[PDB]
Amino acid sequence: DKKYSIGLAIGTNSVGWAVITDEYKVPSKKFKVLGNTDRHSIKKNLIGALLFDSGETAEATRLKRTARRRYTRRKNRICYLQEIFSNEMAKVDDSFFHRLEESFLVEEDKKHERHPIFGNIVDEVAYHEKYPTIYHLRKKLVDSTDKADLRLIYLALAHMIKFRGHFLIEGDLNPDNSDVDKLFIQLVQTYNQLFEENPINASGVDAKAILSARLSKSRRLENLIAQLPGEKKNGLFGNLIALSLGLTPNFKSNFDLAEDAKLQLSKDTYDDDLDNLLAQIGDQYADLFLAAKNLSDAILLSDILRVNTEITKAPLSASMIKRYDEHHQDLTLLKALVRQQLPEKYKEIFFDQSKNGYAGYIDGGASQEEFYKFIKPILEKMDGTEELLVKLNREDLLRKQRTFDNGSIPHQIHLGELHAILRRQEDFYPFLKDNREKIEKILTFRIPYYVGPLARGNSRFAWMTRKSEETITPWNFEEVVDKGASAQSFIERMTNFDKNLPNEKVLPKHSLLYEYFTVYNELTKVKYVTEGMRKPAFLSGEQKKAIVDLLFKTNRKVTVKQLKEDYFKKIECFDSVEISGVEDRFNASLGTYHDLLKIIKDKDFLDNEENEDILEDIVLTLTLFEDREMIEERLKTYAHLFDDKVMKQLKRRRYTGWGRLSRKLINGIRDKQSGKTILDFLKSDGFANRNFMQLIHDDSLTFKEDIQKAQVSGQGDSLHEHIANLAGSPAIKKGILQTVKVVDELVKVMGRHKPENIVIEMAREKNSRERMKRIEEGIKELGSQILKEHPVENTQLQNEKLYLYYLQNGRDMYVDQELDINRLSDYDVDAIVPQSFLKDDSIDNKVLTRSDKNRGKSDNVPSEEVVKKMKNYWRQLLNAKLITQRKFDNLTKAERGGLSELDKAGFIKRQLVETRQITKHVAQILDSRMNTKYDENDKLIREVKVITLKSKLVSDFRKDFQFYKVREINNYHHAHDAYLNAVVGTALIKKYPKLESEFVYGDYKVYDVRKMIAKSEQEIGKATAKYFFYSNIMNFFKTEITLANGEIRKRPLIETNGETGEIVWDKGRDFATVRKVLSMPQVNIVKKTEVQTGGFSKESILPKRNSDKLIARKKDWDPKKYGGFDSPTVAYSVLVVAKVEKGKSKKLKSVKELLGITIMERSSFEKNPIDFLEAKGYKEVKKDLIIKLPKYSLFELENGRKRMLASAGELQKGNELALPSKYVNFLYLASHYEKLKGSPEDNEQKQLFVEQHKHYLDEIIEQISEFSKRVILADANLDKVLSAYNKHRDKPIREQAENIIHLFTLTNLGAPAAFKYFDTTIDRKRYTSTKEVLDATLIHQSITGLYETRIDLSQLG
DNA sequence: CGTGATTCCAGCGTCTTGAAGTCTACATA
DNA sequence: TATGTAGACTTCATATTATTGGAATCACG
RNA sequence: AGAUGAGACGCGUUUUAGAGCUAGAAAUAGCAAGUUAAAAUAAGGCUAGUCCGUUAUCAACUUGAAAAAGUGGCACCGAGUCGGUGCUU
């Protein structure tokens, strides 16, 4: 019944929880232990951690589910195609389909003849010889007009439909005119007919090879132009070739036109633009451009497939046949050459399936790239292989028909081939003629994005609403599914709700309102300085409107030069202007406005606000519904305002992505007194010009209050729903839920009381190239030659001193002293703002100088004399991006305003307030779960204060007072960090009452910079209630205060509250108490048990083998003939005490053994456990003794050895290592784990401490041994570690600890893992036997681990 | 003849966009 | 006519790793 | 730098078919051939659909078919995974 506080630290893999009283001790409690063991009470501390498997995302589940749906859909499509052929096939061959369906079974289990296609070996051999592959059959069917057997037609159709190719390309691309060279000849003929006086000789030019080569468009155009000595690329023929290749040529020069004749086939408007062009050029040239477009289509076809013969009626089959012929010829040549020149490598390449040779490439698992890499050196070594080497460079050597690059084949090719086959063979089979439309519909059927899966109220993923209850087929899909209702449901379901307003719809990424908001947001912080203006002024409403209209509505991108010239010079008549806040091209732009102006060609319509809503409905309509038909259907309602060309142009364009804000948050909510929305505020703000971040965080505006009101009550009362809907990764949400459960358990344990303070902080969860680019840009801007004199790479630039030296161009930021490399060790990095005023330690805050005394006087900011010295030097670095704007202003803070009260207030808020918002939601959950009562004023009684603090304060506290953390020694660091969280939070709230307004939730009123800030000097006694003149937060804990020049100040031995007089910190006992708490050997580490769910087993389908470990992939197909999956993931083990038949006599012998239940059999076991256990071979099962052991069950054996049952057959280390604080401090100091920043005298003292306590290293190697012999029992690894340590006893202490930190994985918690001591690698130790835990003590531990239930398994059986 | 130590392995790619580099008609001396 | 010169426009990328439990393999007292 | 969600594509993997031949009596040796196709692609279930099955959740005991609810004093001295003492019961 004593007042106490709870400290919680939340992490992705950990939840640390500690309990503190008001004396900063740690309470210890007696707990009863249930079960049949002798122990009936155990004393445990209230500080510990909870560990669990990291939360797994749902991406894998989504991918697997989609794959399964696609496979079922494809199988049903094949079934429909078989249905169409059912009658005719039964007329021709009554058992063909049954033979096709059962081909996978071996001869023993087959019901018909083993040969599928024809049922006799002779006809099968004839078919295979007459057609090597199905592509030969398809081409033969297409070209020939003779009647073919029904089975061949069925096989061709099935292979066409089962693999229909992608549907990315929309429209039509196969006009049956795709011969590149032939179309080029036709274009030349048309050009010669139109221009008889200027003919072009194209004879001898291999246009087909040039255009179809794997080269860029410009390169191919140049190559083709080079083949015509008398033609240039800017000529009419060159422009036509560029258009065919897909470039953007201008025909204005060729015909001396006034309008810029820019024609591109990608743009839809070309359809009109060409015709309008013809208006000036006449109708004679139309055929020329039609031939050019046909040639372009031929080139596009040639991009994806290669063909030479002109007799092709099927562009795909001919290409595959050509590739097959090339493969055959190259294989024969390669075999001959290998047998001739290098007979020693014949067997390896052509017989060994293990190797990456041809045998492994065809029969084994060798991929194409592996085979190319293996055969390239052999081909290079041999002679006469120039053809093969060229093919290998072109990646077309010994290829197959099924390759990874077939994923670009559009369905048009297969559709055309199927249409050709049906046209050829319908004259001999009437049903094909009658059902041609059905087959084409089956092949082209694509379930549209909006429609979604075709469920009937049994699936939680589908939202399709049908017009009638009937089976859905591709032939009648147009009428069964109601398009409009499904589209509306898709709109209302798919869109992601706004984070700020959970009940509002987010805007489209390219919506007009969102783009306006983005433009205005950055527009309100732009400033301009001219000659006549004394001080820069903010853009007024008239200026912003003029800039938007003249620039944002006329130029796609607005640059700094454009802003300065087109507006300030043209309108404001300013010759020189200095733009502040924005540099270079603006990030925001009105792209959608320009796109709509291009389409509708009505600027006034876009400028009309009344039509805006309609425009919005357009943007969303183009944001989603990729399918064209629905775009047309929905835009039909607005088709009355636009022409058919405009409607088609709107249909063609499609947008992507989404925005970040809702529509109401931009223009829906209005302030109480002003009566203006956010966009209205940005339009006319006047003096303030507050941005969106300031507008939503302005305490003087109702916007923040409305945001707070809308945020709460986001969903129902259920905790699970609130956890689920939190914006974050699954791991962090699991951590939050576990944290809530842990704090509820703690509330329960402490006698149904309620904590007075709860502290929660959440751990935060490439650069070298960026820093190198920044350095290069700065050097190029300055022109210095320091890089040539001192070259460096990214590996050596780890130390911040070198980075500062490069950023300073080998100079000093305080004096005009040239930097010396040999003096870099003597140099001391100093913070621009002293550590007393602010603990920033950032790179921009760091400055490298010869002597810190040169920084200036005791004033925090460096002296303004240094500013007068190096104003230009600093501004050059600022303009060269070497330094940041914040760093430049901090260097010049003394000149500008010294140390204004605003700087102090900002420092305090930055040190205190939490930037992220997830912590606020966690605090809201905790407050609603603790505060449940109201006062007389109907206001929530805030008994529990949920204070939140950043991790930086706790890290600084750890580093200040020799409280060092090592993230590899053990897992107590989570609990210790939670304990320090609680201590710091309680101390800070007690010391500073008013600042609690920022800590505790929004119920407390806000304050201002007036209080707690002294105008000048360190006023003694704090009479005016000013808490800290210095801008620190936690500096009162230490016994001294440093200054900028090096001056020192002292603090009282005991710190007490300023007003109430309560003691807040007893420096004579509090540090000793914290040391004792951190030195406690007993900390509660419990692993959260998780019954394993997931894949039934590894998905790699292993070949057949003579073992029982294989699991059948189907009910009938036993694994002894067809192989199957292996290594199932055991969901949870089951301890059964029963008897099993033994020997030929089947004698029942009592056995106690662990049985693993797979995920596949889990449902069967959980339905009828007794029947399943009997089926596996257990007789007379003790139902009451069946004990469920999930993964991570805890076992204790003699001498405190702990194990975790990771599965049915592998155990994990279950013990933690409790090290004294002195050894941890020695390990952290000696290893230089973090940066060595600090006072040089302090660094020297730490180095002396490291040197004087070297022998501790040996002690550590002792303790692990004494630990290992009672915990790990891995003698070989321990001996190898001892030998390696003895070998490296002479290594320097700088690197004699970086290896010992990695050495602790030997006796760590979790799964065993291999490590490396210097160059000697110690492999992981495996526990292949779990028989011992059958005679150990099982420990059922509560979620926080305070309660126990010990079961002595030895007392069974 | 388990038994303990050692070795190898696990289903995976794409569905557009933006900065980079460059060629160009045009302004100015 | 020679040299910038903004500008329009094609081009080359536009994410990496990882545990840890199963099974196989093999020396071995 | 926040998660969930709809539609396709390309493969990969496993069995079978594409009679391997010659000299041996087999074991073996030599020679020819390599591309493709059918089925499956988590066991399967009922709700029988172009549905659903790898996300979230899950200590023990008692009640409740489930959703959920309820279960065990405290103080002090120390510290090798907690022990001892006092008090209460």
Side-chain angles (χ1 to χ4, degrees), chain A residues 475-519:
Chain A
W475 311 293
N476 62 341
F477 173 84
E478 292 283 349
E479 59 186 15
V480 172
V481 167
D482 196 68
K483 315 175 74 64
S486 294
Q488 181 174 349
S489 290
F490 175 64
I491 280 299
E492 296 179 14
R493 184 191 214 95
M494 208 288 313
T495 58
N496 310 325
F497 294 93
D498 197 334
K499 51 178 60 180
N500 306 127
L501 309 181
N503 288 22
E504 298 295 336
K505 301 177 181 179
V506 75
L507 279 178
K509 168 60 185 175
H510 289 274
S511 179
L512 287 180
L513 290 180
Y514 192 90
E515 294 183 9
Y516 264 153
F517 166 82
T518 54
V519 167

Side-chain angles (χ1 to χ4, degrees), chain A residues 1294-1335:
Chain A
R1294 171 60 215 274
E1295 296 185 23
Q1296 205 176 172
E1298 284 283 340
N1299 289 277
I1300 297 193
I1301 297 301
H1302 299 151
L1303 187 65
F1304 257 149
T1305 315
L1306 172 57
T1307 78
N1308 207 28
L1309 194 74
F1315 48 92
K1316 295 188 302 180
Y1317 186 82
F1318 276 96
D1319 302 333
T1320 300
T1321 305
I1322 306 302
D1323 299 328
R1324 357 120 43 163
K1325 178 57 174 55
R1326 307 289 294 280
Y1327 302 85
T1328 61
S1329 178
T1330 68
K1331 189 203 65 58
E1332 58 175 4
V1333 309
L1334 304 167
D1335 302 331

